[PDB]
Symmetry: none
């Protein structure tokens, strides 16, 4: 019962740097809905 | 599910992924000055 050679995958700049994206992306979405409403209501 | 995540010292997402950050970060700065002014001028 030999073992079949199985490839491996390493994690790099995936879930590490992504933590910083939440700031730009997260703020983008929140700003889109926030600015849109605040701006629309200002009209 | 034998597979799992891991962290190691390496260089990645140098000037490649950074291109996507410009969207979040860039919009953040532009939104800060834009929203601030638009909001301030509101009242």
């Amino acid at each position: 019962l030999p073992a079949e050679e199985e490839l491996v995958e390493a994690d790099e700049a995936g879930s590490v740097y992504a933590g910083i994206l939440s700031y730009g992306v997260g703020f983008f979405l929140f700003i889109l809905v926030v600015a849109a409403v605040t701006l629309c209501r200002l009209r």
